[PDB]
Amino acid sequence: GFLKLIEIENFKSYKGRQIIGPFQRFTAIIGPNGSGKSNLMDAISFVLGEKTSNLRVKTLRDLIHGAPVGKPAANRAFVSMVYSEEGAEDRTFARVIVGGSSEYKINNKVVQLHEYSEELEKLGILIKARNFLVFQGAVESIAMKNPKERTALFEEISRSGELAQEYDKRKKEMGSGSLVPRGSGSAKQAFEQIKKERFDRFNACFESVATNIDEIYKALSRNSSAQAFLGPENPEEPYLDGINYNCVAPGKRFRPMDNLSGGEKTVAALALLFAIHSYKPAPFFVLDQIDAALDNTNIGKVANYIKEQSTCNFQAIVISLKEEFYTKAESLIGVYPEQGDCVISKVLTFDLTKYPDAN
Amino acid sequence: RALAKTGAESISLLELCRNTNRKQAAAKFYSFLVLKKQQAIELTQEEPYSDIIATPGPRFHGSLEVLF
Ligand SMILES: Nc1ncnc2c1ncn2[C@@H]1O[C@H](COP(=O)(O)OP(=O)(O)O)[C@@H](O)[C@H]1O
Ligand SMILES: [Mg+2]
Hints:
The complex is a heterodimer of chains A (359) and B (68).
Chain A: E1 2-11, E2 14-20, E3 26-30, H1 37-47, E4 76-84, E5 91-98, E6 101-106, E7 109-111, H2 113-122, E8 133-134, H3 139-144, H4 147-158, H5 164-173, H6 185-221, E9 227-232, E10 243-248, H7 262-279, E11 284-288, H8 296-310, E12 315-319, H9 323-326, E13 331-338, E14 344-351
Helix pairs in contact in A: 4-6, 5-6, 6-7
Chain B: E1 11-12, H1 13-16, H2 22-37, E2 41-45, E3 52-56, H3 64-67
Antiparallel strand pairs in B: 1-3, 2-3
The complex binds adenosine-5'-diphosphate and magnesium ion.
Protein name (chain A): Structural maintenance of chromosomes protein 1A
InterPro entries (chain A): P-loop_NTPase, RecF/RecN/SMC_N, SMC, Smc1_ABC, SMC_hinge, SMC_hinge_sf
Family (chain A): Belongs to the SMC family. SMC1 subfamily.
């Protein structure tokens, strides 16, 4: 499905009740500095289950408009997502701040966080892996992160990480940790068994992403010269060591990853982002200033990939400071500030498809 | 010479963007956001994707002939 709109009430600078959207398949959020773009990113994170400590506040009630200066606008606030699916009525997912605590609701029925997370997972929205959200200043780290941390991402998405506890126990019972490990046929079999189970869970995900990533990196680069390789440091037990990621940019000679430009690292990061989506598709991505390090050539190639993918595969919500990027979206959500006790954010909507993208 | 540069009671963004291309129209939309931040205009939008109407704000602003 797709994210039809967000409804926000008294959340950070978004005073009062406001509709954000409706979204098109490719929508860009824009506005001058200080208007409330980052607060809107936080509202999206919040309704999708983000922990309060990752939302730039010391307490949940400080997310209520005006609360940080002891002038809270209300005793409650909420963010709501309207999720639409062809052949189905709209479904509303909401998180409400009530009495310093979070209440989760699906179609105005209160649910516990477990069921909220479980219902989202059925839609492709994984609130632990969070593979559909890229924060400001974070896109390059996706391509340059520690190989061992890349393995943890694959263990979370594939659920192979669920087996790590049993794996560790069976390994020790087989003699791991003794000077000369000796294991019976049985304790060895129990370890070979849990190892096969973790291997199969991990590879069901990793092999798909690794065999799809090259085509995606080519399609982002839009050249045949480009190549992307994902490979385990430990081929027999990929979950025990790092996942190597190396690329050859098109018309370029090979370089290691920390030698690439910010923009080249960005494209490599997005290829991995979208290769994960080819295995476990998310309905939408929220991308906060991922164009920061992109030159205009790469902005064009990324926007074209989104546009030639937003019809069918996924929806893209981007926050952008660069007109070269956001003028390629179907609609703009413009954020502006209003004067008050605190900064108040409000939004306008603008349909770019009315105008020729030409001269 | 500067006294004769009279203006309207409201400005329609969609009217401003008639016969513009996408980049020009986006830039006018963005300028409305900046003018509002500067309190040079007030903004109304009846519903999402309706026309966006500017009226004078509580702060003076120069060069409004070129902005509109
Ligand atoms: N709970 C709140 N109540 C009122 N205003 C808030 C609250 N939280 C943040 N703000 C205000 O919102 C503004 C920051 O908004 P932000 O989204 O970061 O702007 P930008 O568009 O540059 O990303 C600050 O003035 C900040 O004090
Ligand atoms: Mg910001």
